[PDB]
Design a protein around this ligand. Sequence first.
Ligand code: A1BS7
Ligand code: ZN
Length: 139
Amino acid sequence: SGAIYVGNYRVVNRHLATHNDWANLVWEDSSRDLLVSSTTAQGCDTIARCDCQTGVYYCSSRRKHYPVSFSKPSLIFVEASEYYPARYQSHLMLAVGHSEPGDCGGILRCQHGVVGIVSTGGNGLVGFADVRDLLWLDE
Ligand SMILES: COc1ccc(C(F)(F)F)cc1NC(=O)N1CCC[C@H](C(N)=O)C1
Ligand SMILES: [Zn+2]
């Protein structure tokens, strides 16, 4: 679990979104596993605007942060789950690191700010849904 709070927006994994998230829907993209809902309270996370390939993510299944090198956002094949059939997920970045399903939502950050959130994993790899291209999150 986990979310990004920036301005009047809440960014979560689309497969973990709640009824309140869907009743206050701003945008969602199943191909990215992202959903953005509106909030009453103001958010203070800074979204990074860069092409960094190094950062640190929070791994709830170890209660620890890990430094990682990660790939550029791209279309990557993702195994079927109870949330989606087998498909290409877009804007996904992979790193070598530990992750379990409940780790989704953990933030990946670089020196510039929030890069994305844990969205996939398996086989000693962890995948992050990028949010750096969502320029509208700031306005
Ligand atoms: C952080 O996620 C995991 C981490 C590790 C493993 C394991 F196979 F090793 F057990 C599995 C997962 N689960 C996932 O990758 N997904 C299930 C939830 C929906 C995700 C999506 N974006 O389509 C895909
Ligand atoms: Zn950066």
